[PDB]
Amino acid sequence: HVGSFYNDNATAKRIVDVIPEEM
Amino acid sequence: RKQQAVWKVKGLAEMCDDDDAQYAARLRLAQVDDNSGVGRAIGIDAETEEYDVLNSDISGVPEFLSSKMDRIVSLSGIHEIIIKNKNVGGVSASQNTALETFYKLVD
Amino acid sequence: LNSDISGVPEFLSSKMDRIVSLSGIHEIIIKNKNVGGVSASQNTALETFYKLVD
Amino acid sequence: RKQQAVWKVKGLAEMCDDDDAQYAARLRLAQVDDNSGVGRAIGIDAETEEYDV
Amino acid sequence: NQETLIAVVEQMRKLVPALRKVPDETLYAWVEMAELFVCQKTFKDAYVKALALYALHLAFLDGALKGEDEDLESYSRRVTSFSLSGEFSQTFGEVTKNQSGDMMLSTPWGKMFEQLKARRRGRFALMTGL
Amino acid sequence: NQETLIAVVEQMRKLVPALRKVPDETLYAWVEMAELFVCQKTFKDAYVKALALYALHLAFLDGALKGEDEDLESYSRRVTSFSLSGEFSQTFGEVTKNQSGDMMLSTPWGKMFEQLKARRRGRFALMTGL
Amino acid sequence: NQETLIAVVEQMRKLVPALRKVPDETLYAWVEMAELFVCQKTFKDAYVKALALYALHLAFLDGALKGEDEDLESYSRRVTSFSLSGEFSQTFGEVTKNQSGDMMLSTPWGKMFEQLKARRRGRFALMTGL
Amino acid sequence: NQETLIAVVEQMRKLVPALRKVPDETLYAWVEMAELFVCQKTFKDAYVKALALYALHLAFLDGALKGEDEDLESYSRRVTSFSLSGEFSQTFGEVTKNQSGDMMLSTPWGKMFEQLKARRRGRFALMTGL
Amino acid sequence: NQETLIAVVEQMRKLVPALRKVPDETLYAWVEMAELFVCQKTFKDAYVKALALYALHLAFLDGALKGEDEDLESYSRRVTSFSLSGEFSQTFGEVTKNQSGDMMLSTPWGKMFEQLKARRRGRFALMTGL
Secondary structure, eight states: OHHHHHHHHHHHEEEEEEEEHHH | OEEEEEEESSSSSSSSSSSHHHHHHHHHHHHHHHHHTOOOOEEETTTSSSEEEOOOOOSSSHHHHHHHHHHHHHHSSSSSHHHOOOOOSSSOSSSHHHHHHHHHHOO | OOOOOOOOHHHHHHHHHHHHHHSSOOOOHHHOOSSSSOOSTTTTTTTTHHHHHH | OOOEEEEEEESSSTSSSSSSEEEEEEHHHHHHHOOOTTTTEEETTTHHHTOOO | OHHHHHHHHHHHHHHHHOOTOOOOOHHHHHHHHHHHTOOOOTTTTGGHHHHHHHHHHHTTTOOOOSSSSOOGGGGSSEEEEEEEEEEEEEEESSSOOOOOOOTTTTHHHHHHHHHHHHHHTOOOOOEEEE | OOHHHHHHHHHHHHHSSTTTTSSSHHHHHHHHHHHTOHHHHHHHHGGHHHHHHHHHHHHTTTTOOOSOOOOGGGGGEEEEEEEETTTTTEEEEOOOOSSSOTTTTSSSSHHHHHHHHHHTOSSSSOOOOO | OOOHHHHHHHHHHHHHHTTTTTTTHHHHHHHHHHHHHHTTTGGGOOOHHHHHHHHHHHHHTTTTOOSSSSOOOGGGGGEEEEEEETTEEEEEEEEEESOOOTTTTTSSHHHHHHHEEEEEEEETTOOOOO | OOOOHHHHHHHHHHHHOOOTTTHHHHHHHHHHHHTTTTTTTTTGGHHHHHHHHHHHHHHHHTOOOOOOOOOOEEEOOOOEEEEEEEEEEEEEEEEEESSSSOTTSSSSSHHHHHHHHHHTTTSOOOOOOO | OOOOHHHHHHHHHHHSSSSSSSSSHHHHHHHHHHHHTOOOOTGGGGHHHHHHHHHHHHHHTTTOOOOOOOOOGGEEEEEEEEETTTTTEOOOOOOOSSOOOOTSSSSSHHHHHHHHHHHOOOOOOOOOOO
C-alpha cells in the first residue's frame, strides 16, 4: 500500500507534492 | 565499530556463568574501560593476561552515499537542487540558470 | 598502543547533509554558516528559501 | 561486507547441532556482537579461543 | 546431599574395580573435594557421572590416593627400578607424556570430562562489561 | 532403551574376541557411559556400530578396563620390563606415538569413529548469531 | 547383498594367504564394517576390489584382528623383546614409521586404496552454496 | 584463630594418610606459614580446604618436611641410586618435569589450588590509577 | 586379455629370478590388481614392461606377497633380531629410508616406473574448465 510509504518517507512526500503546488 | 579492545585471561572458562565471579569480573571490566583513555594506563599481570586493540578504517563512505543519492535523483525525474535541497553543488551561477530544467518540466 | 582519526569530520558533514535534505529547508538556514559556497551576490543562494516562503 | 569478525573456539563441533547448547551459544554470540563497539571490550579465554577481524 | 555421595561412590566403583577395598570415608572425602570444582546447572542429568569422572581424575592426577602406610618420602620422588640380588629385577616408567603443560590432559578421565563438558556446554567464555 | 544395549555388546564381542569372558555388567556400564557422547540422529542407521566403536575407544583409551584384582598403584604407572633371575626376561613398550595432542587419534577405533563421523555428517561447526 | 560378501572374502583370501584359516563369520563382520566407508557409484566396476582393500586396511590398521585367546592387556601395549634364559632370544619392532599423522598411510593397502580413489574419482571437494 | 588450625590439620590428615604420625607442632607451624599466602575474602566457604591445599603444596614443594634426623647435606642434593654389594640395588628419579619455570605447577596440590582460585575469583589483575 | 597375462608374468620372472617357484595363480591375481592402475594409451608399446614394473612394485611395497604359512601377526610388525642360545645370531634392518612420505619412491621398481612415465607422457596435469 502506497499510503504508508507516502506517510512515513519525507522524500516520497516531497516527490509527490512538489509539482502540483508549484503549478 | 572502528576500534575493538580484546582482553584475554589465562583461566576464564572455569566460571559458573551465573555466580558472583562473573558479576565481579564484568563490573571490573566496565569500570576499567570507563576510566581508561589517553593519559590513563592499565596494569596488566604478565604471563597470565594480555590486552590488544584492533583498528579499522572509514575511507569512502560519503562518496558511496552521495552516489546512491545521485541514483535516486536520476530515477525520480526532478532536479537535484529540489530533492537534495542544497545549493553550492555547482559554482555560483546567476540564479534561474540551474532551475531552467525544473521550470521547463513544470511548464 | 596508537590509533588514528582519519575521516570523522566528513562523516559528520554527510550526516548533517542528510538532515538538511530531509528537513526541507536550505542548508544556509540550518547550518547557519556561509562560505560553504563561493562568495555570490547575496540573495542568489537564498532564492530557493524565498520561493518556499512565498 | 566491509568487516568480518571471526570467532574461534577449541571444542565447537561436538554439539548436536539442535540441542540447547547451540541455542545458548548463538544467543551469547548475538548479544556479544550487539553490545560491542568502541568503548566496549570482550573478555576472551586464552589458550582455548581467539577473536579476529 | 547424602544420596548423591553414595551414587557417586557406587559409580566410581562400577567404572574402576579394585577401588572397592578402599575404605568408604576416603572416597567420601575425595568426592566432597571434587564437588567444589564441578558445576551442576550445565551438566544437569549427567551430574553423578561428571562428579565420578572428576573424582577419579583428582584421585589419579600424579599419584595422590597412595595408602595408609606409604612413607612420607615417596610424595616428591619415585623408584625407577628395583632388584634383589639374583632373585628378580623390575623397572618402572611413566604412563604417558603430555606435551602441553595443561592439567586435565594427563589422565583419560580428565580427557573424558573435558569432552563431556565440551558436548554439554562448551569450552569458551565470551563476556562484555556491565 | 534395552535391546540397544544387547545389540551394542554383541557387536563389540563380534569385532573383538576375548572380550566375551568379561562380565556383562561392566560392558553395560561402559556402554551407558559411551552413550553420553555419541548422537544417534547424525549417525541414523549406523547407531549401533558407532556406539560400539566409541565404547571400545573409551575402554582402550590409555588402559581403563583393567581387571578385578589389579593393584591401585598401576593406574598412574606401568612396568617397562620384568625378569625372574635366570629363568626368563621380557620388555614392554607403548603401542603407538601420536604427534598431535588430540584424543580420538590414540587408538584405531577412535580413528575409525572419526572417519565415520566425517563421512556421515562432517567435522565442522559454522554458526551465526540469533 | 550376499554374493558380494562371498566375492569380497574370496578376493581377500586370494590377495593375502593364511587368512583362509580364519573363521568365515569374522571376515563377514569386518566386511560389513568396511562397507560403511566405501562408496559404490565412484568405483563402479572395481567395487569388490576396493572393498577388499578397505577391509584389509581396517583389519591391519594397528592390530585389530588379534585372535580368540589373546589377553585383554595386549590391546593397549606390545611386547618389545622376550627371551627364555639361555635357550633363545628375540626382539621385535614396528613395521614402518609414517611422518604425517594421517590414517590410510599406515599400511600398503591404505596407500593402494588412496591411489585407486585418486585414479577413479580424485581427492578433492569443490563446493558452492545452494 | 585456633579451631581453624585444628580443622585444617585434620583436613590435611584426611586427604593424605601417613601424615598422622608427624608431630602436631610441625603441622601447626607449616599451617601458620601457609596462612600468610592464602586469602580469605575470595575463598569464603572453602577457606579450610584452600589452606590445606596450600599447606600441602608448601610441604611437598621440592622436599621440605624431611625429618628430625635427616643429614644437613641432603638439602642441596639427592641420592640417585644405592646398592649394597650383591644384596640389593635401587634407583631413584624425579616425580615429574614441568616445562614452565613457574611455581604451583610442580605438585598436584598446587594445580588443584590454582584451578580452585580460577573457579572462585580468577587469575587476573586489571587496574587503573587513582 | 589372456596372452597379455602370460607375457607380463614371463617378463616378471625374467627380470627377477626365484619368482618362478611362486604358483602361477597368485601372480595372475597380482597382475590383474596392478592392471587397474596402469594406463594403456600413454605407454603404448611398453605396456607389458610397465605392467610388470607396477606389479613388482605392488608385490614389494612393504611386504605383501608373504607366503602360504606366514603367521597372521607378522603383517603389522617384524622381527628385528633373533638368536638361538650359543648357536648363532642374526640382526635385521630396513632396506632404504625415503625422506618424502610418497609411495612409488620406496622401491627401485617404483622409481623406474615413475621415470618411464615421465619419459613417455610426463608428470603433470594442466586443465581448464569446460
